[PDB]
Amino acid sequence: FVDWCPGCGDFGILRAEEMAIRELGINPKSVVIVSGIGCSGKIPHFMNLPISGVHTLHGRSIAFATGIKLSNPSLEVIVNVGDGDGLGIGMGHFVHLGRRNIDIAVLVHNNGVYGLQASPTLHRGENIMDAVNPLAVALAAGYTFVARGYAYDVMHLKELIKKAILHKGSALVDILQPCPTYRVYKLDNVPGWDPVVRKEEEAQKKFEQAIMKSYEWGEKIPIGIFYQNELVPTFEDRLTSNIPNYREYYPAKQQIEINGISTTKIDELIKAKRI
Amino acid sequence: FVDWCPGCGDFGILRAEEMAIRELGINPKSVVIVSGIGCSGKIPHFMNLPISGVHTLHGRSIAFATGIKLSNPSLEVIVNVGDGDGLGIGMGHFVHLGRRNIDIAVLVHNNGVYGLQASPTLHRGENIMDAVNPLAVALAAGYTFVARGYAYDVMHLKELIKKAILHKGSALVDILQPCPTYRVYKLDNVPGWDPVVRKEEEAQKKFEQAIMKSYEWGEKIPIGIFYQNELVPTFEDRLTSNIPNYREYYPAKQQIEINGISTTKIDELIKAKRI
Amino acid sequence: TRIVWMIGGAQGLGVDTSANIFGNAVAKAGYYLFGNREYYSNIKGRHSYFEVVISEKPIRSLSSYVNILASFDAETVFQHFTETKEYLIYNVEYENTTVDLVKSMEPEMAEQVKEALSKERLGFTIKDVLEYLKRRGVKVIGFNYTELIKKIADTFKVPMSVVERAKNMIAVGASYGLLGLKFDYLKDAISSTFKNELFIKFNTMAAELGYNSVPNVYKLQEYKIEKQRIQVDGNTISAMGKLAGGLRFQSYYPITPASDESVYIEANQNLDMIVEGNELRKGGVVVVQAEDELAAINMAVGAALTGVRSATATSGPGFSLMSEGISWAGMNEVPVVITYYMRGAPATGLPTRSGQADLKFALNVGHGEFPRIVIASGDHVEIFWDAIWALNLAEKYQTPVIHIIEKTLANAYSVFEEELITNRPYVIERGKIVKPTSDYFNRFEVTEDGISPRVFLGQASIFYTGDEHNEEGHITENSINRMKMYEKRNKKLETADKEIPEEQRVNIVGDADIVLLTWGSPKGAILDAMEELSKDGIKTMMVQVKMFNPYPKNLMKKILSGKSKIIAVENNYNAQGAEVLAEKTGIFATNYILKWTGRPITREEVIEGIKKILERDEKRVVLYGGA
Amino acid sequence: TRIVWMIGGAQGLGVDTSANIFGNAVAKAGYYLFGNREYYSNIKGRHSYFEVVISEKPIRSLSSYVNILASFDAETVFQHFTETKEYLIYNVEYENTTVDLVKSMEPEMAEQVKEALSKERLGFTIKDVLEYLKRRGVKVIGFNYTELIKKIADTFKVPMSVVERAKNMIAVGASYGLLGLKFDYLKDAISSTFKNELFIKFNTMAAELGYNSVPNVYKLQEYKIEKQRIQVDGNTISAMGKLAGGLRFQSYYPITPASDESVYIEANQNLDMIVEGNELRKGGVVVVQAEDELAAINMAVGAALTGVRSATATSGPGFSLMSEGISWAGMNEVPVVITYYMRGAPATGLPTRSGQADLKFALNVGHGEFPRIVIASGDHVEIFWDAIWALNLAEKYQTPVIHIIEKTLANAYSVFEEELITNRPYVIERGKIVKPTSDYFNRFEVTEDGISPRVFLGQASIFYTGDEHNEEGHITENSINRMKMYEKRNKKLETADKEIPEEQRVNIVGDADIVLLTWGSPKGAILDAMEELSKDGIKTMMVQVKMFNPYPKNLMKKILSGKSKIIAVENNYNAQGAEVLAEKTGIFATNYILKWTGRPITREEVIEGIKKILERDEKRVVLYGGA
C-alpha cells in the first residue's frame, strides 16, 4: 500500500525518478535506491521496475551507499533522503561524500518538517533554530554537481535527476516539496548561464557563481544546475591508482573461494615476517 | 607534565587563549574550556589560571558546551577542538551550533593530521580525500562571527580570541598550526575592510564578501575577521522570549528543593487532567 | 463490571479523539478506564484502533476480546471481528465489500481474514463477517451513515463534506447508548473537546442520532466520585514526575514514543515554584531539540556538570546512539537520567509498537564497567514516582540512571485517583554536594563508599576527562591510580546495593507456589489474571522486578526458594528478565509466557498461558493476539 | 631457559626499534620470543618500555620480573628498578639525579618511587636505587654514554648530535653481550633494519662498544631452527587471517589499537589470487578511512549487501558508536565482522592500555534480540584462525560477528613456527547463497533453521529495511508476520548452537579439581603458571572460553561438575566471563584473580594468585604490577 497522505509531493519525485531510470536504459536490476527514515524513506518500496531498495537508518544512507558503490561500482546507486534525515542527523556524512566525489546521486526531499517537528530547512520564526542552504553546504563540501529541482515541475525534475546520475561524481539535487499535514525560475532559461567547468582555470569562477546564485531567494527562486565539474577525479579514479584492475575486478566480482578453499595467497605476507 | 612534542604550535594557542581570558578581566572561575580528543584535546589541563576543563569525547565538544552554556549562561564557554575532532567526527554538531547562534567561541586547531593519518583539512595528493574550507562551512552554517588566525602571530591571535568571546553569538576562529612529527596577511591592514554588519539591509553584502574572501588562497592568505553580525538573536535571546526570567533565574541558579522537599508545583498540570 | 469497547478507523479521521470523548463521558459517569491506541508508522490512511476498558473499579489491563466494536468503515470490521463478543456497530454501505477491495489493509491481514472466514466456509464480504458474528451470539447493529450525515447537513444547511467526520460521533453515540448512561455526559465531553461552536453542534446531533437509535442493553448506573480522579498517559506522567523531581534541562531528538514527553515539558516549561521565605517564583525548564541523539545525550550530560538536574528521552535506535555518551557520564560520574521508551526492535523495528527486548543492552550499555542504575516502571503510577526516584538516584550515586518505560504504557492512558501521585511528599535527595573551601577543587576524591563530593562548574576550578584520571581530574595512566579510581566508581554500585532496600526494588503480590516472574507493563494483566484464577482455585503470586541494577538478589533467593513453578512473563523472545535472575542467583524459570509482536499482553493471554502450563507443562507459551 | 629483558626510554627516541633489533638478533640465534610494548597516550617525551622474554622453547607470557634492565636515562631506572632481578645497565651521568628532576614522570609514579625507597631508608637518587638493587644481589653496570657517543662521533667525524640515538644500541649491545650470543646476529639485525649506510655503521659501532664492555654471563648457546619461524603482532595477524578468509572491503576510523590493522591491509591491498583454471590474478581489497565510526560500520554493512566479505575494526569508544549499525545488520541479517580491539575503558579510558571490560556489552550490543556471534582470541595463533572463522560464521548465519582481540595481544608480538598458520587449509564457507531464478527475489524466506537463502545486489530485485518486514523485505507491522520473522532471525542462534561443536568453543588443558576459568589474553600466563605449579605438586586445569555466543553451556556443565575451586581469571572488575557462565548454567566461580590496570596479567601474578587462594581462600585477588 502506497501509504502517504493525499496532497504529499513525494508522488512527483517517485514519478520523476522512475522516468529518469527508464529513459537512461540502465538495467533496473543494477539500480539500488538507498533511502533514509521518514515518509521520504518508504519510496523504493512503491516503485514499478525491478530496482532494489535499501531502507536504512536515519541519516545513514550516504554511508551505506558508499559501501555498496565502492564494492560494486557497476551498480547505479541513488540516495533519497528526507531533510531531517540528511542535513540533520546525517550532516557529517553529507559533507564527507563531497570530498570523496564518489559516483552517486543524492536527492533531498525538502518538505520543511519531521513528517513521520521543525526540520533543519525550516526558516526562523513561523521554530527556535535557523535554516541551512543545502546547496551552499554542498558547494563548500566539494560536491561536483549541485542542483535545485522542484517537485511539481515533474518534467524538469526528471531531467535534473538524469544529468545527476550521468554526472561523473557526487551529485546533489535539493528538491522543493510541500507537506499538506505538517513563483520560481530556470537557469536553463537564462542566456548567460553555463555552470559546466570545461577546463581547470575555469573552476574557481564557476564555483563562486554557483555559491552566489545559490543564495538568491527574493521570490526570484532559481532551479536547475548551479555547478558541474567533471574534471575532479572520482573516488573510484583514486582507487584505480592504488588498485590497477579495480574497474575490471572490483571487490563484488572477485572469486575468493574454489570448492571452499581460499584463492587468496598470503605467502609473501608471511615470508616477509620470517626469522 | 605538558607532554606535546617540541616544535608543536599548540603552545602558541594556549599562550594566546590564556592572554585573552586575562585581558578581558573575566573571573576565571566562570570560564569552562571544553576540548576534544587528540593532542589538541589535552589543553586546559596545562593552563595557569583557575579555569575549569571539560575534556570530552571525540567530536562531541560542541554538544557538551551547549548543555553547559544553556544551563548556566553566566559561564563563559570556549570550545577547543582539533581538525579530525570537529570537522571530521563532529561536523554535524559544528553546523548546528551555527543555526542556534549560542554565545560560545569555537577554536579549531588546524594541524592537518590525526596527531595522537590524514585529517579533513589535508589537501588532495601530497591522501585519497579532499580538504574542507572550515570558514565557508561555518558561513553557510550560519556562524555569526568567522575568523582565521595563525598560531605564530600570537599577539594577533590573542585579539581574535578576544573579539570572538565578546561576539554576542557563535564564533569560529580557524587557527593555522604546523605539526613537526606528522607568507600570510591581515584584513586589519586592508583599507576597504569592514566585516561588521551594522544594519539588516547590509547583511547579504557582508556575507557574500566573507564567503569569497574565505576562498582566497594563492599565497595571499588572509587572517583576521571575515564576518560579524550581532543583529542575529542568540539562542539565549530566543529562550528569553519563551522563558521571561531565563537571564535572572537560569536552570543552574534555581532552588529546586528546601529541606529535601520539591519547590516545584505541578498542581495546575495535574488539575488540567481531572475528570 | 469490566466492559471493553473498541473504535477504529483510518488514521487522520480523528478517531483517536472520538475515543477520548467516549472515555471522557464514561469517566464522568463514575467509571474507571484503561485505554490503548494502536497505529501504524504512517500518518494517513492505515487502520488505527482504540480499546477502552470500562469498570466501576480501577482497571489495570487490556483484554483479548471486545464487548462492543464500533465501526463506520469496512476495514475496522475485518480487523476486529474475531475479537468481537456482544455488539457490532457497523455501516451497511459496506455490506458487499470484499476483503480484496480494502486497499489500505496489509496483505498479510487480508490473508488472515480470509483464512478465518474459510475455516467455517464463509466468503470474504462484510455480510459474511456478519454471519460469522451471528454464529457466536453477537448482535449486529447496522447504520446507513450516509443517510444520517445527510440529515445533519440538511439541518445545518451545509454540504455533506463539512460534516463527514461525524460518522465518528454516530458510532460513539450508539456505543454509549448501549451502555445506558445519560446523554448529558456525552454532550458535555463534546462541548469540552472541540472549540468552534459549529463543530460542537453537528457532532452533538450525530451522537444524539446514534444514541437514540439503540436500546439500553448494559443498564449501567452512575457512580459518585468521592476522591478527585485524573486521566493521563505514560508520557505525560513521566514529564510530571521529572518536573516534580526538579528537572530543569532536557534535550531530545524526535522519535515517536518519546517526542510527546519533551513537547509537553516545553508547552509547560515556565513552572510555579514556592521558594525561600515562601515566595511564588517562576522557573523555566530549558528544552532543546537536538540535531541527533549523540548531541542529545551530550547536551544533557554537560548541563548536569552545572548542577542542573538534566535528562533526555529516547527510544531504541536513539538509545544505541547514546551509548558512548553514557559511557562518558559513567567515567566522569555525571548524574543524568535517560528515559528509555522501549519500542519494537531491532533497528527501526516497529516504531509505533512496544517491546521489552533491550533490557540487557540497557544493563550493559557502552564500554567499560561503571554503575548503570536501571529501573523499569510497571504501570502509570509507578512511572510518576520512578521518574523522581531516577533523578535522586542519579545525584546520590553520581552516575547515569536508565528509566525504562515501554511504549505500551506511554501511549496507554488510565483513569485513577489523583492522590496516588499527590499524597506522598516529593522528596529531592541531592547526595554528596559540598561548598568548595578554595579556588581549586578535587572532583574525584577516593572515599570508602565510592562517592566523591561534588561541586558545580562555576563554584571552583574542576576538571573532567574521558581518560582515566586522578582525584584532581587530570589524565593519569598510573597503574595504582587506575586500580583505585576504577574500583572507586564501581564501588558506588555496592554502596547503592547496601543503601537501597531490596523491598523497594520489586513488588510482591500474593504468596503461593506458582510464581509469575515479570517486570514492566505485564504487571497489570497479571494482577487482573491472578484474581480470575483465584476464583477457579488456582493460587499464584506475582514477583515484579522494578530495579534490575543493583539487582535485589538476596530477596529474590529468599522468595523464589522452594517454588515449584516460576513462570517468566515478558515481551521478548529470550526472557531477558529471567536471564538476569539466573545470572545473579542461579535460579532458572521453569516456564515462559512470551510476546514479541509489539502489542500488550492481555489479561486473558496470561490466564490461558498459565492454564496451558499447569495442564500440560508447556515450556514456552508464545502469544500473538492484537491487530 | 626463560630470560626476561626490558629496555625503556622517552617516546620518540626510537627505543621500540631498539627492542625489535635486540629481539631479532636473539631470534636468529634460535630463541623464541614473547614481546610487549607499553606506551602513554602521548607522542613524545613520556616513558615507554619494551619487555622481551627469551626462551629455547615457545614462550606464551610476560613476567613480573626483569633479569636484565637496559637503560640510558634516569626515568627508566626509576620506573623498573623494583622489577629488576639480575643486571642493570645504566648511565652514570644520572647517578645524582633525584626523582623530582624527572619532569616527564607522572607525580603518582614519583610518589611511589619515593615510597619504595623510604620503605628501606634510602633517598631518591639514582645512586640510592643502585644500593636498593645491590641489597638484592643485582649487578649494576654503569656506562659513561656521553664519552662513548663522543668516541663514535670522533670516528665518523660528525658532531655528537647526529649519533646521539646510538645510546640505544650501546644498551642493546651490552644486554646482548651478557647473554653470550655471537655479535654477527646483532650486526645483521642492524644492517637489516636501518636503510642508510651511515646509520648502519655508527649504530653497529655502538652495539660493539656495549657488547665488548661486558662479560658473557648467561652463556647461551645457539640452536638450530628446524622449521620456518615468524615474528608477528596481533594486528598484523588479524589482517593476515581476514585476507586469507577472503576479506575485500574494510572501513575504519583511526583509533590507536586498530588503525595498524587497516594500514597494513591497505599497504598490501593488491593480493595474489589463484583463480579458476589455476590463473594468477591480482585482486584489490578496498580500504576506506571513514569520517566516523557510524560511517565505518554502515559502509561495511552496505558493502556486504553486494556479496563482498566485509569487516571493520575499532575499539571501545568506536564500538559504542557502532551499536546502531550492528542492530541494523542484525535485523537485515547482514554478514559483517567487527574486530573489537578491547582497550582500557570506560570512555577514552586508557587509549594505549588493555582491558576485558566490554564483554557483556559486546554480547548485548544494540537494541532488539538478534544473533550476535561473539568470539575472543586467547593468543596470537588463535587470532589468525579466529579471523577466518569469524568471516565464515558471518556468512553461514548471516549476522554480525564480533571478534574480540585485546589490545595487549595487538601490541604484543611473538616468534612461533610458521606452520601454525599454514599447515591447515584456509576454508571458506559462504552459507546459503543461491542463484535467483527470476527478476524478483524474496530475501527473507522463513525456513525451519532460521537461515534464508541469500542473493547479492545486482542479481535480482531485493529489499532491505530497518523496519520489521515480510519475506519480500517490505515494511510489515502484521502481528503474525512479526511473530514469525522475529523468531526466524533468533532461531539462527539455535541452529548455530546445534551446528558448532561445543569443543571448538573452549580450550581445555589438564584435568584437575582446581579450574582456572578464563577467556582471552590470560590464556598464556595461565598455561605457563600451570607447569610451575605442577612442579610444586599443585594440580590445575584451564578452561578457556573462545565463543561466548552461542555459549558452550552443556560442555561447561559437564566439565565444571563437581569441581571444588573455579577461579575466574580476567582483566576486569566484575569477572564478566564468569557472569555469563553463571547466567547460562547457574555455576558460580568460587574465587577470582582480577586485573583492571590495563597491563597484561603475568605468569607470576597467576602463580601467586592461585597460592593466595589455596593457602587462605582469598575471594578476590586484585593484581596491579606493571609501570
Ligand SMILES: Cc1ncc(C[n+]2csc(CCOP(=O)(O)OP(=O)(O)O)c2C)c(N)n1
Ligand atoms: C536513530 C534514529 N533516531 C530517530 C528516529 C525516529 N524518526 C523516524 S522518522 C522521523 C521523522 C524523520 O523526518 P525526515 O527525515 O524529515 O523525513 P520525512 O518524514 O519528513 O520524509 C524520526 C524523528 C529513528 N528511526 N532513528
Ligand SMILES: Cc1ncc(C[n+]2csc(CCOP(=O)(O)OP(=O)(O)O)c2C)c(N)n1
Ligand atoms: C569515538 C572515538 N573515536 C576514535 C577515537 C581515537 N582517537 C583519539 S585521538 C585521535 C586523533 C585525533 O585527531 P585530531 O582531532 O585531529 O586531534 P590532534 O591530535 O591532531 O590535535 C583518534 C583517531 C576516540 N578516542 N574516540
Ligand code: SF4
Ligand atoms: S506526513 Fe507530510 S510528508 Fe509524511 S506523508 Fe503525510 S504529507 Fe507526505
Ligand code: SF4
Ligand atoms: S603529534 Fe603533532 S600535534 Fe600531537 S603533539 Fe606531537 S606535534 Fe603537536
Ligand SMILES: [Mg+2]
Ligand atoms: Mg523530510
Ligand SMILES: [Mg+2]
Ligand atoms: Mg588536529
